Amino acid sequence: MEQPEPDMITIFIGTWNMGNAPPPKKITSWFLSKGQGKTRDDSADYIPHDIYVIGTQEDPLSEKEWLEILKHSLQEITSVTFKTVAIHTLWNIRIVVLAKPEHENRISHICTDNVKTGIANTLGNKGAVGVSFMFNGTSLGFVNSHLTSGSEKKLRRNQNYMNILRFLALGDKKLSPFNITHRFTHLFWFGDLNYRVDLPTWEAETIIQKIKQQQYADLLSHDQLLTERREQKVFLHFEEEEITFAPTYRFERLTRDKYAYTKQKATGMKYNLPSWCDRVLWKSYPLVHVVCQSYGSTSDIMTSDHSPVFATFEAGVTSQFVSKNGPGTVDSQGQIEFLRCYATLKTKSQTKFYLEFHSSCLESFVKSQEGENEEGSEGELVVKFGETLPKLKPIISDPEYLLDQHILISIKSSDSDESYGEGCIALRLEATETQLPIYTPLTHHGELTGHFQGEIKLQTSQ
Numbered sequence: 184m185e186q187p188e189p190d191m192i193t194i195f196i197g198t199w200n201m202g203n204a205p206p207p208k209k210i211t212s213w214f215l216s217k218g219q220g221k222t223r224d225d226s227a228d229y230i231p232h233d234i235y236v237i238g239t240q241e242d243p244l245s246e247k248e249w250l251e252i253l254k255h256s257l258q259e260i261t262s263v264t265f266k267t268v269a270i271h272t273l274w275n276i277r278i279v280v281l282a283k284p285e286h287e288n289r290i291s292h293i294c295t296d297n298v299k300t301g302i303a304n305t306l307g308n309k310g311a312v313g314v315s316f317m318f319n320g321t322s323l324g325f326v327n328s329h330l331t332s333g334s335e336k337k338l339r340r341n342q343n344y345m346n347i348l349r350f351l352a353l354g355d356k357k358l359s360p361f362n363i364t365h366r367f368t369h370l371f372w373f374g375d376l377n378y379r380v381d382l383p384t385w386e387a388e389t390i391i392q393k394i395k396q397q398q399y400a401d402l403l404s405h406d407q408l409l410t411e412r413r414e415q416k417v418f419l420h421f422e423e424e425e426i427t428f429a430p431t432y433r434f435e436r437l438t439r440d441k442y443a444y445t446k447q448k449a450t451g452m453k454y455n456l457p458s459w460c461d462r463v464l465w466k467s468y469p470l471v472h473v474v475c476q477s478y479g480s481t482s483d484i485m486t487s488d489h490s491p492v493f494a495t496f497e498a499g500v501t502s503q504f505v506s507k508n509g510p511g512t513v514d515s516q517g518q519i520e521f522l523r524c525y526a527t528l529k530t531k532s533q534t535k536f537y538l539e540f541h542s543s544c545l546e547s548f549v550k551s552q553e554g555e556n557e558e559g560s561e562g563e564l565v566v567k568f569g570e571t572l573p574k575l576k577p578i579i580s581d582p583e584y585l586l587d588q589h590i591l592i593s594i595k596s597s598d599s600d601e602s603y604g605e606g607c608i609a610l611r612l613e614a615t616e617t618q619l620p621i622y623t624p625l626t627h628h629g630e631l632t633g634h635f636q637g638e639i640k641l642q643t644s645q
């Protein structure tokens with residue numbers, strides 16, 4: 184009488200800077216996506232999410248104490264006893280992943296890690312924790328980061344982002360060229376990112392007036408995370424739902440009636456103008472279903488100087504496919520061919536380059552021959568592969584499997600075997616046995632380094 188495997192799940196993401204205070208008795212509004220912003224319909228209140236991922240910062244509780252509160256809250260909402268998938272804490276930065284008990288045998292390859300940011304006097308409270316796992320055929324990654332504070336420190340925050348994405352060790356270690364921004368079908372990155380509304384401090388009361396009027400446009404046009412993303416300084420290739428809730432920081436505790444912005448000894452004589460510190464972003468592989476269903480803040484949880492933030496997603500997932508052939512052999516019907524491909528790179532290097540193709544649909548990664556370097560009119564390096572690239576032999580040829588897969592590409596120096604660029608191509612093509620255009624930007628350490636384009640031709644068993 185077996186349950187069919189799901190094609191979609193829903194995922195709850197929560198981020199809350201607890202302000203080193205215990206929570207109040209009831210926090211159910213957080214997990215129900217109730218309060219301000221894009222909120223969840225009351226008719227869904229009893230419907231559990233498949234996975235709940237809870238990020239806290241300045242968390243004063245033990246793991247045991249917080250788990251008890253989280254599992255009690257979900258049991259009260261859903262009448263389901265959730266299973267702990269993972270919990271990881273760095274200082275007062277914590278991530279908890281809970282899942283429905285029906286998913287226990289669908290979840291495997293659980294990994295946890297942390298990154299400590301800063302050096303000397305800036306090393307010791309900021310950084311990130313993360314969790315990854317497989318859910319049937321789908322890889323999922325989660326990062327909770329507490330970045331550097333202070334309106335004046337946006338460039339430090341961006342540097343913290345770069346260190347966390349470089350050094351966090353999650354997902355499949357065989358993906359050696361790839362950082363966390365390429366290792367997962369779906370990556371969620373959330374936390375107290377600490378980006379501020381960059382307006383003069385003498386405009387504090389004007390900001391507060393705008394918030395009372397629910398007029399956020401002239402505030403969001405100064406939000407440092409939106410502006411730094413627009414200028415491609417941080418979070419390149421990530422998505423964020425539109426913000427329609429009031430700034431989540433800095434509140435007087437025990438009410439939400441008051442923003443506490445003025446400089447005090449306790450703030451290091453810094454102003455804390457109302458800001459959207461607390462954020463949820465995501466990055467999914469191309470042409471994978473991911474829809475944000477809610478993004479908002481609670482109104483009734485007042486123990487911290489921050490309000491909790493919620494986001495929920497519908498995320499596509501795939502099954503653990505088994506054929507008569509693969510896993511454990513190739514499906515000789517299937518092939519992936521690349522035509523007229525070239526990489527464009529921002530490097531001043533003149534080493535030869537080769538490609539690596541990595542995918543779960545291959546027995547192991549495939550190394551190309553070196554490309555042919557030409558110079559581009561506007562200075563650039565163009566690496567031509569023509570029709571020279573290997574024919575890739577997937578383990579399964581069934582189009583129901585193969586059109587859902589993705590090929591990661593790294594372009595590496597022949598001289599150093601270091602990756603100069605990483606990207607991803609979807610096999611969710613408009614046609615099979617047809618030459619079709621393909622494209623990915625290339626990044627290294629999460630920054631743009633070039634592009635890969637050409638044509639693909641996919642053979643399936645149909």
Ligand SMILES: *Sc1ccc(N)c(F)c1
Pocket residue numbers: 292293294295351352353354355356
């Ligand atoms: S689970 C896991 C273990 C080790 C590394 N490097 C990972 F990325 C993940």
